[PDB]
């Protein structure tokens, strides 16, 4: 039944749960299928070899490189199988050219040489354990069937699609269980003819496009009704139709807007799917808007085409998603590359048929050849949304396919676009195939039957170690208002309430001659009261986000940090906080997470010297009088390699890390000098301005740390190869990118439960064993109807993974902290929303309450 598909937009406009939206678990059921796709003109190549016929794409290549110099795959059977053997995929998807055996204008003499290759390939796949998913038509047309017949506009070409089908089953035998008749009819019909961007035609009114699609639709009718009358008795496989569709989201979620969106699918998906599953008639939407330029069915052929399919085959990728697609049936609507909310629409619309995706993938630029980091994570979110569909949607998905096993030609963007699973160079006479990152991920996906629970992924029971530090973070506290915090902090069971002082406000001019003691006595009273209610707060001095970098106006216009003297200026302020506020503090932070990519190198040497002078003073003059521990807090956003099995990502992983974490840590934590990798990189590229450490200065920096205040907000990726000339750092040879399969914030801040684990272990390996902290970790709001969805997963899994280091590996911990307990001082980040000039506990507050009072998961 039709019309019922309008519910899928509202059904998936409100995600029932982030766990369903994330789906970090689950496995595919027994019998689920896997295959890898390829195109006829993308990879095969050659047009006189062994008797191959000419193609329309040959003419299109001359005047809009060429498919005559493709990756030499027409007679070798071990080149692709070697890629198949590594993949180990149970099925393989490809296409057969129309002109290979019948290039004549009347289906002339078949060429046995082309048959011998495909018989060889079919026999090879059986031995390895691979079965084919073949398509008899992939955007190709014979030349001699074009000039005489004048393109797909003529009806007689549908007859030529039938006799060729008579040999498709016979020549390839009965082994081929699955079949696709025509792939992506829409782009062949409209963009193939009307716009002329594709192989045939030079220009055409939309009048030709509707007729061409109509003839192609009957071509499906021609090929099915042959199968059930001549082949199925000696068979039992299924033949289906693949339709290319793109999801559409409403602009304003309006009844007429969703009607347009529902109508929009009908011009792309319902153009052929409507009369092949449900009733054999064209959609009523076209009959209204399109007056008479759309050909209509007759009564005899309406029944001839009704229900001519067994399962729905689906298409996605760069074919018509944010790519070649006519603006007219866009209906001024946005595009979204989603599978979970499109697979449901097909299941409800067409009376619940089985689904088998035939073409799906994404593309990378032509410059990248080794690390196709873009294609890996685009591919994985696709295999996410099928698992979300089978489990959380009830739609039966029988298999999945990955596009572009081998690189080829994109038919409109030239060779500037690469998509193959295995990269082949353009300067090789042998066209040797090499493994890629995507193939490695696909290698470790089938043998695991999906994404089964893992010891790291599966939560592990544990108990919190005693004397575990706690507290919330507010580094923008405004200096009358003491009571609301302590009342809220006491309910929070805080032990070390983390905050700062806003040093710029501490000293109006940066000198001790004058100072406003009103804000100085603010901290003394609040810290002492916190001790009465059992809080020993965390103190911070300097902040990275400030117009003047936290320095007064006088101290900001004269080399704010480049001045050698301003280190002494920070030194007097160090005594200022220690001489009065040091009695009620046990845990100290001086440089609260400086940003480590914009800050100048030359002034960076100053910052490392400032801590050394500051740490010595409190140690040799105040540590004995008042006991305490003083160390530093550094930005430690984990840099995970994009491909875990790629060595090049590993070396560049430290370079961004070392300039971020090691630049302000190696002089402090390590031997006392800069990391080796950052010293060589400056020397190798003949670019250097970073000063060295003198012998007297080296001993100052080293050893001035007691604890380690790791900061971890997210887990960003690293990429060595340049992808775009805008967001790839030439100086570091590092491309920043974020995995999008993760639960992403509305501000595009990812959540990674395992990201805290690796950085926790990594810092111990370089800097030895020491009492480590986690000083900064938090997430924003999200899903603005119940703001607990992203945070019920954030803090539950982050702290659980944090204890996994203690139980499994053995990295020592002493405290865990949460960021921005309120939203007034941190937009979008708050736990207590600032609504109606009041702070209220968002339901995740109980979630954070339970773990704190219970002190970890209650063990057996």
Curated annotation (Swiss-Prot):
Outcome after substituting residue 858 to L: In a colorectal cancer sample; somatic mutation
GO biological process entries: calcium ion homeostasis; carbohydrate metabolic process; determination of adult lifespan; energy reserve metabolic process; fibroblast growth factor receptor signaling pathway; negative regulation of systemic arterial blood pressure; norepinephrine biosynthetic process; positive regulation of bone mineralization
Extracellular topology ranges: 1-860
Annotated Gene Ontology cellular component terms: apical plasma membrane; extracellular exosome; extracellular region; extracellular space; membrane; plasma membrane
Source domain of life: Eukaryota
Region (Glycosyl hydrolase-1 1): 24-451
Secreted as UniProt keyword: yes
Enzyme class: hydrolase
SUPFAM superfamilies: (Trans)glycosidases (SSF51445)
Sites carrying sugar chains: 104, 228, 289, 511, 516, 598
Record note on modification: N-glycosylated.
Reactions catalysed according to its record: a beta-D-glucuronoside + H2O = D-glucuronate + an alcohol
Record's disease association: Tumoral calcinosis, hyperphosphatemic, familial, 3: A form of hyperphosphatemic tumoral calcinosis, a rare autosomal recessive metabolic disorder that manifests with hyperphosphatemia and massive calcium deposits in the skin and subcutaneous tissues. Some patients have recurrent, transient, painful swellings of the long bones associated with the radiographic findings of periosteal reaction and cortical hyperostosis and absence of skin involvement.
Description of its domains: Contains 2 glycosyl hydrolase 1 regions. However, the first region lacks the essential Glu active site residue at position 239, and the second one lacks the essential Glu active site residue at position 872.
Misc note: Defects in KL may be a cause of chronic renal failure complications.
Subunit and interaction comment: Homodimer. Interacts with FGF23 and FGFR1.
PANTHER family (alphabetical): GLYCOSYL HYDROLASE, KLOTHO
Family, as annotated: Belongs to the glycosyl hydrolase 1 family. Klotho subfamily.
Official protein name in the record: Klotho
Gene label: KL
């Amino acid at each position: 039944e039709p019309g019922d598909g309008a519910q899928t937009w509202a059904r998936f406009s409100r995600p029932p749960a982030p766990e369903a939206a994330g789906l970090f678990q689950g496995t595919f059921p027994d019998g689920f299928l896997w295959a890898v796709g390829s195109a006829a003109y993308q990879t095969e190549g050659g047009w006189q070899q062994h008797g191959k016929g000419a193609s329309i794409w040959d003419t299109f290549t001359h005047h809009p490189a060429t498919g005559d110099v493709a990756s030499d795959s027409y007679n070798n059977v071990f080149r692709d199988t070697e890629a198949l053997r590594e993949l180990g995929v149970t099925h393989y998807r490809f296409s057969i050219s129309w002109a290979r055996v019948l290039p004549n204008g009347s289906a002339g003499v078949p060429n046995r040489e082309g048959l011998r290759y495909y018989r060889r390939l079919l026999e090879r796949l059986r031995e390895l354990g691979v079965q084919p998913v073949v398509t008899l038509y992939h955007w190709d047309l014979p030349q001699r069937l074009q000039d005489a017949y004048g393109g797909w506009a003529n009806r007689a070409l549908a007859d030529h699609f039938r006799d060729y089908a008579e040999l498709c089953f016979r020549h390839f035998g009965g082994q081929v269980k699955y079949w696709i008749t025509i792939d992506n009819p829409y782009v062949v019909a409209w963009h193939g003819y009307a716009t002329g961007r594709l192989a045939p035609g030079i220009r055409g009114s939309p009048r030709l496009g509707y007729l061409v699609a109509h003839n192609l639709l009957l071509a499906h009718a021609k090929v099915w009704h042959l199968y059930n009358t001549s082949f199925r008795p000696t068979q039992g496989g299924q033949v289906s139709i693949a339709l290319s569709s793109h999801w559409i989201n409403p602009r304003r979620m309006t009844d007429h807007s969703i009607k347009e969106c529902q109508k929009s699918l009908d011009f792309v998906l319902g153009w052929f799917a409507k009369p092949v599953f449900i009733d054999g008639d064209y959609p009523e939407s076209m009959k209204n808007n399109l007056s008479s330029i759309l050909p209509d069915f007759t009564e005899s052929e309406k029944k001839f085409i009704k229900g001519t399919a067994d399962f729905f085959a689906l298409c996605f990728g760069p074919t018509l998603s944010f790519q070649l697609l006519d603006p007219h049936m866009k209906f001024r609507q946005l595009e979204s590359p989603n599978l979970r909310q499109l697979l449901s629409w097909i299941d409800l619309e067409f009376n619940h048929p089985q689904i088998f995706i035939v073409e799906n993938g994404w593309f990378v630029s032509g410059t990248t050849k080794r690390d196709d980091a873009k294609y890996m994570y685009y591919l994985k979110k696709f295999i996410m949304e099928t698992l979300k569909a089978i489990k959380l949607d009830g739609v039966d998905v029988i298999g999945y396919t990955a596009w572009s096993l081998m690189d080829g030609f994109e038919w409109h963007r030239g060779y500037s676009i690469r998509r193959g699973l295995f990269y082949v160079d353009f300067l090789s006479q042998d066209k040797m195939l090499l493994p890629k990152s995507s193939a490695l991920f696909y290698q470790k996906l089938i043998e695991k039957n999906g994404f089964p629970p893992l010891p790291e992924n599966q939560p592990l029971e544990g108990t919190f170690p005693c004397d575990f530090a706690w507290g919330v973070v507010d580094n923008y506290i405004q200096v009358a208002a003491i009571q609301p915090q302590i009342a809220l902090l006491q309910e929070m069971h805080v032990t070390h309430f983390r905050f700062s002082l806003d040093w710029a406000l501490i000293l109006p001019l940066g000198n001790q001659s004058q100072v406003n003691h009103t804000i100085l006595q603010y901290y003394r009273c609040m810290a002492s009261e916190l001790v009465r209610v059992n809080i020993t707060p965390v103190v911070a001095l300097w902040q990275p986000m400030a117009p003047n970098q936290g320095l007064p106006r006088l101290l900001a216009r004269q080399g704010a940090w480049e001045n050698p003297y301003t280190a002494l200026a920070f030194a007097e302020y160090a005594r200022l906080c220690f001489q009065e506020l040091g009695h009620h503090v046990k845990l100290w932070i001086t440089m609260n997470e400086p940003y480590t990519r914009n800050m100048t190198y030359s002034a960076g040497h100053n910052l490392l010297k400032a801590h050394a002078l500051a740490w010595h003073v409190y140690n040799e003059k105040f540590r004995h009088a008042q006991n305490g521990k003083i160390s530093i807090a550094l930005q430690a956003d984990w840099i995970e390699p994009a491909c875990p099995f790629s060595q090049k990502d590993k070396e560049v992983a430290e370079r961004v890390l070392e300039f971020d974490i090691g630049w302000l840590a190696e002089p402090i934590f390590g031997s006392g000098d800069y990391p080796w990798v950052m010293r060589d990189w400056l020397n190798q590229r003949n670019n250097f301005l970073l000063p060295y450490f003198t012998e007297d200065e080296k001993k100052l920096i080293q050893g001035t740390f007691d604890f380690l205040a790791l900061s971890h907000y997210t887990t960003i990726l690293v990429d060595s190869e340049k992808e775009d000339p805008i967001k790839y750092n030439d100086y570091l040879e590092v491309q920043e990118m974020t995995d999008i399969t993760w639960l992403n914030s509305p501000s595009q801040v990812a959540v990674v439960p395992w990201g805290l684990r690796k950085v926790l272990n990594w810092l111990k390996f370089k800097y030895g064993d020491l009492p480590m902290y986690i000083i900064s970790n938090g997430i924003d709001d999200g899903l603005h109807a119940e703001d607990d969805q992203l945070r019920v997963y954030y803090m539950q899994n982050y702290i659980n993974e944090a204890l996994k280091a203690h139980i499994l590996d053995g990295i020592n911990l002493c405290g865990y902290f949460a960021y921005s307990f309120n939203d007034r001082t941190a937009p979008r980040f708050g736990l207590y929303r600032y609504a109606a000039d009041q702070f209220e506990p968002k339901a995740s507050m109980k979630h954070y309450r339970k773990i704190i009072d219970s002190n970890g998961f209650p063990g057996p």
